[PDB]
């Protein structure tokens, strides 16, 4: 559900 830009 939540997107997070890869580190």
């Amino acid at each position: 559900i939540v997107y997070k830009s890869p580190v």
């Epitope: 559900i1 939540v2 997107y3 830009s5 890869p6």
Partner: antibody, heavy 115, light 108 residues
């Protein structure tokens, strides 16, 4: 210069398939996601999904999980979108874009589905 | 889906004017919201990310604000080069969604 260069416009017969390319340059290809977007003149943009070339993970909009396959080729720095079982509804301009924030966009690829 | 509801659908203003447009989120959730400019036949260009942060190389004639779940794009000192369609992007929850767009016409 970050640049995303997409393949030419394509004419495809209904029921057939099309593979669209997005060649990235100006940054390290395996450090940013690539997202794909559909644009039709009367519908307004729809998000298709994304690939992270780093680990080749993918996510899809449910509307497109059956029709779209996102792949990547780190040696040529190219992302691909395969669209299957094409119908007149699939006629549109397709964009690739860098990152979830979409800070750079390709120029778009116009697909015509027609016999 | 957390959809973005955009209005107005079009806008007609004079050179030098201040113009605004809004996207309202379809759920009471915190989201990261971007604004884009797209000219006919061209690729979108990012203006504003995170509701109010100006993308590098974009004029500060462009600005964004957030009031609750209402997001506003403002354009001051309107110029011919600003004639375009503008849309927002919700990029927190999958699937990402876009507002339906605001087409900006210049009076003469």
């Amino acid at each position: 210069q970050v640049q995303l260069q997409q393949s030419d416009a394509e004419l495809v017969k209904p029921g057939a398939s099309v593979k669209i390319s997005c060649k990235a340059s100006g940054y390290t290809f395996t450090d940013r996601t690539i997202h794909w977007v559909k644009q039709r003149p009367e519908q307004g943009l729809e998000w298709i999904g994304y690939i992270y070339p780093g680990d080749d993970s993918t996510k899809y909009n449910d509307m497109f999980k059956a029709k779209a396959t996102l792949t990547a080729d780190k040696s040529s720095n190219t992302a691909y979108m395969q669209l299957n079982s094409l119908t007149s509804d699939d006629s549109a301009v397709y964009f690739c874009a860098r990152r979830g924030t979409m800070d750079y966009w390709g120029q778009g690829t116009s697909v015509t589905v027609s016999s | 889906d957390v959809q973005m509801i955009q209005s107005p659908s079009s806008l007609s203003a004079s050179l030098g004017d201040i113009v605004t447009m809004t996207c309202q989120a379809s759920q009471d959730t915190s989201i990261n919201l971007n604004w884009f400019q797209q000219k006919p036949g061209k690729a979108p260009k990012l203006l504003i990310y995170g509701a109010s942060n100006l993308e590098d190389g974009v004029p500060s004639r462009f600005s964004g604000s957030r009031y609750g779940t209402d997001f506003t794009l403002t354009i001051s000192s309107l110029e011919d080069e600003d004639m375009a369609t503008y849309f927002c992007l919700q990029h927190t929850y999958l699937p990402f969604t876009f507002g339906s767009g605001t087409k900006l016409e210049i009076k003469r």
